[PDB]
Design a protein around this nucleic acid. Structure first.
Ligand code: NA
Ligand code: NA
Length: 327
DNA sequence: CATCTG
DNA sequence: CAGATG
């Protein structure tokens, strides 16, 4: 956690690079199990040889550990941190819609900057175009004070369209958090579930109200159960308009809302432990359900949940206010 | 995993 | 349809 910190870090830089610049998924996956294991490792790694003794730890990595332990640096890392090509890829990638793959093509065609991108807006798709237009806004965290106003609007409009909708804002927002990255709304309806053959309108009507009032400003991706967009809190008595924020809305069959809601709410560490305890209690949980665990090895059959309560209950546990879902 | 692009 | 992004 701090005893093999640099090591785990260098490894991470390395891994990243394989994957992002090279197309070295193998190598890339190599650095990661390695950091993973050194990380768990109980002692202060004093040498490569020591490390090598570990699984995931080969001779090449051992080698690197040496030079780094031997000197506060690593040549390779040093070379990579310079390379403009490598830097461009790390950067373009910050644009929403641009992944590594696209980053390479772009660089190869000589686009390595923001300006580059504007010039060539033509070679970018809708998502990437939007992603460029709001580059700044998108990198700005969302203060809870805004979050409360967003949520305020969203719920009031879903309500109008149909009293029967059930919307929930998950995320760190929900675990208390002072600011957040984007807005994630879980949506359900009685008239939609596991069997029920669809209802696309279910999602579309809402998305539509939201734009009616101008809260949603653009669409990144809109399918029949998941929508990726951009919204914006109306600028008041103009002087101060707000940044454009990322928002996502997803329709879930009512029969698996709470597991969804549970799940999306995190934190990751919370889930795990919860998942791990579920297991003890003779259960299983995932993003959509909790199932009784047979002894034959496994076994299923979705237990029925009416709230996040039902879930805890099941595994016979202490109902946790979202806030303490930290770990 | 669900959407989009080409 | 593969393949890419979130
Ligand atoms: Na990106
Ligand atoms: Na292939």
């Amino acid at each position: 956690e701090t005893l093999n910190g640099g090591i785990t870090d260098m490894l991470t830089e390395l891994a990243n690079f394989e994957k992002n610049v090279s197309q070295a998924i193998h190598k890339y996956n190599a650095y990661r199990k390695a950091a993973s294991v050194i990380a768990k490792y109980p002692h202060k790694i004093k040498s490569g040889a020591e490390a090598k003794k570990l699984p995931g730890v080969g001779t090449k990595i051992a080698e690197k550990i040496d030079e780094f332990l031997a000197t506060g640096k690593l040549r390779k890392l040093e070379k990579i941190r310079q390379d403009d090509t490598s830097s461009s890829i790390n950067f373009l990638t910050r644009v929403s819609g641009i992944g590594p793959s696209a980053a390479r093509k772009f660089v190869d065609e000589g686009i390595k900057t923001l300006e580059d991108l504007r010039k060539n807006e033509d070679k970018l798709n809708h998502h990437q175009r939007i992603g460029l237009k709001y580059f700044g806004d998108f990198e700005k965290r969302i203060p809870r004070e805004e979050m409360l106003q967003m949520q305020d609007i969203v719920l009031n409009e879903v309500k109008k369209v149909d009293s029967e909708y059930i919307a929930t804002v998950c995320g760190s927002f929900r675990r208390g958090a002072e600011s957040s990255g984007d807005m994630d709304v879980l949506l359900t309806h009685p008239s939609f579930t596991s069997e029920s053959t669809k209802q696309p309108k279910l999602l579309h009507q809402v998305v539509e109200q939201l734009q009616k009032v101008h809260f949603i400003t653009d669409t990144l991706s809109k399918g029949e159960t998941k929508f990726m967009g951009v919204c914006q809190l109306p600028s008041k008595n103009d002087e101060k308009e707000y940044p454009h924020r990322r928002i996502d809305i997803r329709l879930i069959p009512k029969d698996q809302y709470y597991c969804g809601v549970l799940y999306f709410t995190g934190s990751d560490i919370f889930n795990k432990n919860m998942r791990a305890h579920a297991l003890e209690k003779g259960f299983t949980i995932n993003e959509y359900t909790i199932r009784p665990l047979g002894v034959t090895g496994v076994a299923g059959e979705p237990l029925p949940v009416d709230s996040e309560k039902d879930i805890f209950d099941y595994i016979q546990w202490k109902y946790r206010e979202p806030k303490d879902r930290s770990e």
